[PDB]
Design an enzyme around this catalytic site. Sequence first.
Site, PDB file in Angstrom:
ATOM      1  N   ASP A  90       0.830  -1.199   0.000  1.00  0.00           N
ATOM      2  CA  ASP A  90       0.000   0.000   0.000  1.00  0.00           C
ATOM      3  C   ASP A  90       0.860   1.243   0.000  1.00  0.00           C
ATOM      4  O   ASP A  90       2.034   1.198   0.362  1.00  0.00           O
ATOM      5  CB  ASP A  90      -0.947   0.046   1.189  1.00  0.00           C
ATOM      6  N   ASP A 125      -3.594   7.480  -3.804  1.00  0.00           N
ATOM      7  CA  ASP A 125      -4.997   7.867  -3.934  1.00  0.00           C
ATOM      8  C   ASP A 125      -5.470   8.439  -2.591  1.00  0.00           C
ATOM      9  O   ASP A 125      -4.998   8.024  -1.528  1.00  0.00           O
ATOM     10  CB  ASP A 125      -5.843   6.655  -4.322  1.00  0.00           C
ATOM     11  N   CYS A 274     -15.690 -23.595  16.953  1.00  0.00           N
ATOM     12  CA  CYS A 274     -14.757 -23.746  15.840  1.00  0.00           C
ATOM     13  C   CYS A 274     -13.969 -25.026  16.042  1.00  0.00           C
ATOM     14  O   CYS A 274     -13.963 -25.581  17.134  1.00  0.00           O
ATOM     15  CB  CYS A 274     -13.800 -22.541  15.812  1.00  0.00           C
ATOM     16  N   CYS A 276     -10.669 -25.304  14.380  1.00  0.00           N
ATOM     17  CA  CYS A 276      -9.344 -25.034  13.813  1.00  0.00           C
ATOM     18  C   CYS A 276      -8.206 -25.563  14.691  1.00  0.00           C
ATOM     19  O   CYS A 276      -8.435 -25.982  15.822  1.00  0.00           O
ATOM     20  CB  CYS A 276      -9.165 -23.528  13.590  1.00  0.00           C
TER      21      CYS A 276
HETATM   22  N1  PQ0 Z   1     -10.709   2.904   3.606  1.00  0.00           N
HETATM   23  C1  PQ0 Z   1      -9.673   2.503   3.237  1.00  0.00           C
HETATM   24  C2  PQ0 Z   1      -8.354   2.120   2.864  1.00  0.00           C
HETATM   25  C3  PQ0 Z   1      -7.536   1.331   3.529  1.00  0.00           C
HETATM   26  N2  PQ0 Z   1      -6.418   1.220   2.886  1.00  0.00           N
HETATM   27  C4  PQ0 Z   1      -6.427   1.906   1.789  1.00  0.00           C
HETATM   28  N3  PQ0 Z   1      -5.371   2.065   0.764  1.00  0.00           N
HETATM   29  C5  PQ0 Z   1      -5.564   2.812  -0.296  1.00  0.00           C
HETATM   30  N4  PQ0 Z   1      -4.654   2.961  -1.194  1.00  0.00           N
HETATM   31  N5  PQ0 Z   1      -6.788   3.477  -0.473  1.00  0.00           N
HETATM   32  C6  PQ0 Z   1      -7.829   3.376   0.451  1.00  0.00           C
HETATM   33  O1  PQ0 Z   1      -8.891   3.935   0.329  1.00  0.00           O
HETATM   34  C7  PQ0 Z   1      -7.614   2.530   1.656  1.00  0.00           C
HETATM   35 ZN    ZN Z   2     -10.702 -21.515  15.859  1.00  0.00          ZN
END
Ligand code: PQ0
Ligand code: ZN
EC number: 2.4.2.48
Lengths: 577, 577
Positions: A90, A125, A274, A276
Site C-alpha cells: 500500500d 490515492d 470452531c 481449527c
Molecule cells: N478505507 C480505506 C483504505 C484502507 N487502505 C487503503 N489504501 C488505499 N490505497 N486506499 C484506500 O482507500 C484505503
Molecule cells: Zn478456531
Amino acid sequence: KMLKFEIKARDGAGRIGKLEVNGKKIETPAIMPVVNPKQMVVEPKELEKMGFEIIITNSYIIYKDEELRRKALELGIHRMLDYNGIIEVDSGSFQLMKYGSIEVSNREIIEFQHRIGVDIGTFLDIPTPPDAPREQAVKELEITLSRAREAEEIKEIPMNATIQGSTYTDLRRYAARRLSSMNFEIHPIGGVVPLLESYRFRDVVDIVISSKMALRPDRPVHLFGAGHPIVFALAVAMGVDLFDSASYALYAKDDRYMTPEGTKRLDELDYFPCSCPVCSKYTPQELREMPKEERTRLLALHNLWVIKEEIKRVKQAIKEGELWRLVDERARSHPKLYSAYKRLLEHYTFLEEFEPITKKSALFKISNESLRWPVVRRAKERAKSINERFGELVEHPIFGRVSRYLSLTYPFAQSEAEDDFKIEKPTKEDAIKYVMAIAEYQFGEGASRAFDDAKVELSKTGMPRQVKVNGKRLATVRADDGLLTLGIEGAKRLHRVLPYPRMRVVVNKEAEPFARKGKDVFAKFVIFADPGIRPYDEVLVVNENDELLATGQALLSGREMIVFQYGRAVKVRKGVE
Amino acid sequence: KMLKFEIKARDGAGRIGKLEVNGKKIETPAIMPVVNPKQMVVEPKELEKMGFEIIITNSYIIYKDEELRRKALELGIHRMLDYNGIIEVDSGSFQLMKYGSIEVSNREIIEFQHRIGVDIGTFLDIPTPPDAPREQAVKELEITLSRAREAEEIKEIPMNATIQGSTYTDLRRYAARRLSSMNFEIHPIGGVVPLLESYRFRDVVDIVISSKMALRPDRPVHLFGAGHPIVFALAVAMGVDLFDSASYALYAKDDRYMTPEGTKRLDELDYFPCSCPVCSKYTPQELREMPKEERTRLLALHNLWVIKEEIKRVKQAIKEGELWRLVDERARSHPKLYSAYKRLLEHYTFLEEFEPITKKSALFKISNESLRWPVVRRAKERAKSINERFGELVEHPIFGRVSRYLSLTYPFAQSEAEDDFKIEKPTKEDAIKYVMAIAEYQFGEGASRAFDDAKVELSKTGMPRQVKVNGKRLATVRADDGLLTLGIEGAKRLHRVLPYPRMRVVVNKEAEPFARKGKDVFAKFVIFADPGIRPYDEVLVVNENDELLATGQALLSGREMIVFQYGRAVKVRKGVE
Ligand SMILES: N#Cc1c[nH]c2nc(N)[nH]c(=O)c12
Ligand SMILES: [Zn+2]
Ligand SMILES: [Mg+2]
Ligand SMILES: [Mg+2]
Ligand SMILES: [Zn+2]
C-alpha cells in the site's frame, strides 16, 4: 500486460477467477493478510504455509523506517519477509486518511515500490472519508485522478487504481468510469473502512455497486479494509474479488475472536464454536490465562483460519450455485447486515446481467428475501409471455401459477419450498408443446418456430429427451435442468428463425477456422455478441457475415465476451465442419 | 434417584445442563455417538479422547451374538468397549422398526442390560412409523406402555422411556403424560427417524412440542436417532437435551460430508468449508485418492468434529442469549428447515412459558420471523395495557408504538433493526410514571399501586436508579434492562397489593428459617409457585400461610420450581428476618 484475469466459475455478480501477476497465479476470491513491517504477529513464512498466496504491507511505513528501508532496498520485500507469493503493497493512503497528511509524494512511493521488487503497487490515492463535504470529495477525487495519470506514465509494475468519492454514488461512477479507461490492472474500492467499522453495510453496498456498474468487468475488484468474515459472502455476491485484513491481527492483540457471524470478546467465550488447529485443542478458560504474547499469537491464527474458512465456504457455494442462500444465511448475523442484504437485492438490473441462466443447485425458498433473488424475478417475466400463449397453468409454491409446459424447466421444476411442487410430465401428444415453450423461454420470442415440426422422444420415464426432425437431432432436453442443449442442426434452425444479433457471438477471422473445427471460443477473439446473452446460455457462434461456425454454451455474458481479453467466452459443443 | 439433572443455563426453551449418572458427569446438550458392537469405524476409546463422554450401543445386537454376548457378560460393556464414560444402550426396538419383529422379550433385554453393566438402558418401546393408521398408533402405544410398566417394576438401572404416539399430537401428549407419572429418568422422543431422513422438520417440530408440553420439565429429553448437525440448534431451542448419531459414520461410508447446513457428496466438493484436524490438512482431491478405508475414517472424524462444533456453538449461543438468532441463521439451510422454524414460532404458548424475562443480549431484528420471537410477542401484549394508560407513545423499530415509559426497559430500549432507536430519558415528574409503567409491566396488573407514594432518584445520566419512600428503599431500576430489582420493602408492598399466589414461591416448613435470613431457595423445598413466574422474574419467597420470608430472583419458571428436586429455585436477595 503483466496481469491476467479470467473467470472460472460464477454465481450472482460473483466469480471465482484465475489471476496471474508476472508468473504468479492465484485463485480469487482471495483475502490478503495484512502484515505489519515491525510487529509481525504471524511470520509471512507461516501465512505462506497456511495457504495465503498473497499478502500486503505498507510501503510507507517501510519507507519511513531506517532499518526497514535499508533492508527492503538491500534484499527486496520478498527476501526481507521471506515470503514467495504475491506481495501487494500500500501507498500510505490509509495513513493519509487517519492523519490527514503524509510525508511522501505520489511519485516517490511509486519509485520506491519499484526499487524493492514489489509484485503489485498502489499510488497515493486520497481516501475521502464518508459523508464528507461534497466539495472535499470532488477536490480530493481530482487530486486522486491526477496522481492516477502520473502513476500511469511511470509505472513498470502492476498497480492498484483505487476508486474514491466518499458517499456520492455519481462520484463513484465517475471515478470508476475514468480509471477503467486508463491502463491499470486491479481496481480497489476505497474509503469504506470507516463504514465497515460502523457496521454501515448498506452504505458499503451502495458504494460498491455504483463502482461495479461503471468499472470494466474484466479487472479484479479489491475492497480495501474489508477483512472480516462477516462480509465475504455479501461482497463476493456483489463482485468483489480481493480483501485485505489487519483485523485478524489487531483483534488478536485485543483478545477479540472472529466468527463468520461477528466478533466475540475472549472473556465472554465459554466455548470455542470452531474446530481449527487452535480451537480444536484449546479452551477459552485456558487461552484466557496464557501469556499475552501466546494469547495474541493464538487468536491471530484462529482469526486467520476462520477467514480462510469462510472464503473456502464462499467458493464452494459458488461452485454449486448456492451463493445467494449463503448470503441469506450470513444476513441473519446482524441487523445492519440484514438491511444491506435487502438493499443488494434491489439492484436487480445490475445483478441480472451476470446471474447464470442455470445452476447446478435447486432454487431454495428459504426466506422472504429469496423471493427477490435475481433468478426468480427473471424467470417470472420471461414466463409471462409463455403462460399467456400456452395456458394450462399449474400451481407453484414459489412462482404461483406457471404453465405446465415450463414445469420441467429450471427454476420451476428445479426448486423446493415449504410445500413440494408437483411436476407435470408430458403426454405423447404434449411432448412438442413443451420443447416449444422451453425454446420460447430459453431463447426468447419466436424461438419455437425452430422446433414446430419436431418429434419429441420420451425416456423410460415420461421425460422429453431427443428433439428430432426428419433425420437428425435438433436439440435435447437436459435432465439436470429441463433446458435445451442445441445440436448443430438446431442451431442452424434457430439461426435462420431469429434475426441477427440474437443468440450470436461474432468472432475474429482468425478464430473462424477453430470454431468450425469445434474448438472453444476465447474472449479475446470475440468482436461482438448479443447483449442479451447471459452466462451458460446456448449460443450461436458466427463470423462477421453471420455465418454459423459452431454452437455452444456461454461462460460470460454478451457484454463481458466483448470486454474480456482472457478466458473462454464459449464452450463449444459441435462445429459446422 | 440414580440420575440427577440440573439446569446450569438456558435460553428459549433450551438449556445447558448437568447430567450425573453412576457418579459420571456430562454437560448437555450432548450428542452420543452410536457405536456398532461389530463394525467400528472409529473406536470408543478414540471417541472418548475426542471428547464424547457419553455413547450408545445396541444391546440387542450384542445379545443375538455369541461372541459379543460372552465378552459382555464377562467384562461388562465398559471393558468390552474400552470406554470409561457413560454408556447408554438401546433395546433393539429400532431393529423392530426396520423389520417388524425382533427375537427378544421386553424382559430379556432389560435384564441383559442389567447384567452387562449398562449405565442407562432402554426397554422395547415400539417405534410406530410417521403416518400410521390411528388404530396401529394406538395399538402399539398401549403395548409400549405395558412394557413400560414391566420396566418400572423389574428396573434396577436408569432407563429410557420413549414417548411414542406416531404423528398424532394427542397420542404424544398422552404417552408423555403417562410416562412422566411413572418412575423413569430420561425420556426419548421416538419414531421420528423417517421424518428426519425425509427432511420433514415441520412434522418433527409438532411431535417434539406436543411431547414437551406433557413431559415433566426436570427430566432429560433425548431425540432418538437425530445425529445431523442441521437440527441441533432448532431441536435444542425446543428443549431437546440429548442426541445420538450413527450418521457420522454411515455417511462416511458413502463419501458423504457433513455441514451445519446439510450434507454434501465428496465427489462434488472442490473445497473443504472447514478447519477440522482433517479438512485442515487434506483437500477434497487428496481425500479422493486415499484408499476407501482411510477415506471413510477421515470423513467420519470430520463429521464428528462438525457435530462437536455445532454443539459448542449452540451452547455458546445459549450462554449469551442469542439462541434464537442461531436458529434463525440455521433456518436458512433448507426450505423444509425454514418451514419447521416458522411452525416452531407458532407455538408461542409453549415457548413463552420458558423464555426468560430479561436477557444479557439485545433484541436483533434480522428477519421477518424474528418479529414473532417469544420475547417480542410477550412484550407486545404486556405493553398494550401500559400504552392505553400512560400513553406518551414513541416510534419503535420493532413494536412500532411504545409508551416512552417502557422505552428504557428490556426489550424495547436494547433493540436494533435496520435503524436505531433513540432512548427517551425521563424528566423529574416522569420519574415515577416510569417506575409505575415498569411495575405494571414487569410485575403485572395493578403492581404500580405499590409505587405511588415513591420518589425516584436520577443518577449522573438522567436515568432512574433507586426508588424510595419514608426514606427506605423499595426497589431499584436495573440499568442494564430497565427492570426493577425489589428490596424487602418493595416486596412487602407487592405482597399486600397483589393477591396470592402472584409472585409467590411457597416453600417447605424446613426451608422457612433459611429464607427468613437470606439463604437461597432450592427447588426441592418448593411446594408450589405462581405459574406466571418466569425465569429471572422478581419473586416473593413465602410459607404456606403466605407470610413473606424474603425476596429474590427466580432461576426457573413457576411450573419448574415445583417439579425440580435438584438445584436453586430462587437466588434470595434479602430476608425479612
Ligand atoms: N478505507 C480505506 C483504505 C484502507 N487502505 C487503503 N489504501 C488505499 N490505497 N486506499 C484506500 O482507500 C484505503
Ligand atoms: Zn478456531
Ligand atoms: Mg473480447
Ligand atoms: Mg420442588
Ligand atoms: Zn472438517
